Amino acid sequence: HHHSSGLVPRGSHMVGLIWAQATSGVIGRGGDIPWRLPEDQAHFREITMGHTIVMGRRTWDSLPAKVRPLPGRRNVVLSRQADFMASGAEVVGSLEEALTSPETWVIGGGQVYALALPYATRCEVTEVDIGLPREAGDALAPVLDETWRGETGEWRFSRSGLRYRLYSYHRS
């Protein structure tokens, strides 16, 4: 399949998704992420810093009030509620309104990844080797079809004592 370039022309609209999942596909439960890996936190910041980040309203809610908006990035929150407000950030009503920058990283959660996938050309995935089964109401990662080509890293070992690995996926 035809080659893509890592360089982002300023007149384009590159959309990437970045998430961390358990091997089962779980990304969230009860309004939180059920792990903290320093390597994943650092990786998330390395990829997203300097770009626009787009998140669903429930992901904004999951950020501690003292830390949001996440610094060094333009924070955009998706909501359908006309009275939802995000101090320090922009709330918009659609993905179309959110995707105005040349490079945008969609940072969660389950609903917004599913919504944004049709426009995305990159996914950066951390897989955590934690035995966490899927339960009703869990937020889940998108499943990538065969239009996506991927590179899977070898299993690595976190200082937190969990194995993890990184995937990078691309499509035209």
Ligand X SMILES: CCc1nc(N)nc(N)c1OCCCOc1ccccc1C[C@H](C(=O)O)C(F)F
Going by the annotation, the residues of the binding site are 18-20, 27-32, 40, 45, 56-59, 73, 78-81, 93, 107-113, 126
Closest CB to ligand X among 4 and 21?
21
Give the total residue count for the chain: 172
Judge contact between 23 and 129, C-beta under 8 A. Answer: yes
Rounded to a whole number of angstroms, the distance between the first and last alpha carbons of the chain is 8
Contact partner, 63, from ligand X, Na ion, ligand NAP, none, Cβ < 5-8 Å per class: ligand X
The residue whose two tokens read 């080659």 is: 3
Residue type, 41: Q
Number of chain positions touching ligand X (CB under 6 A): 15
Which residues in the 119-148 window bind ligand NAP by CB under 6 A? Answer: 139
Judge contact between 116 and 109, C-beta under 8 A. Answer: no
Gap between the Cα atoms of 15 and 3, Å rounded: 17
Provide the minimum distance between the beta carbon of 33 and ligand X in the complex, in angstroms, as a whole number: 5
Contact partner, 111, from Na ion, ligand X, ligand NAP, none, Cβ < 5-8 Å per class: ligand NAP
Q: What mask of x and - would describe binding to ligand X in positions 42 to 71, judged by CB under 6 A?
A: --x--------------x--xx------x-
* Residue 126 in contact with ligand X, rule: CB under 6 A: yes
Residue type, 137: G
Closest residue by Cα to residue 18 from 58, 45, 37:
45
Q: Report the largest interatomic distance among the alpha carbons of the chain, rounded to a whole angstrom.
A: 45
**Using CB under 6 A as the criterion, which residues of the chain lie in contact with ligand NAP when the complex forms?**
19-20, 27-28, 31-33, 56-59, 62, 78-81, 84, 93-94, 107-112, 115, 139
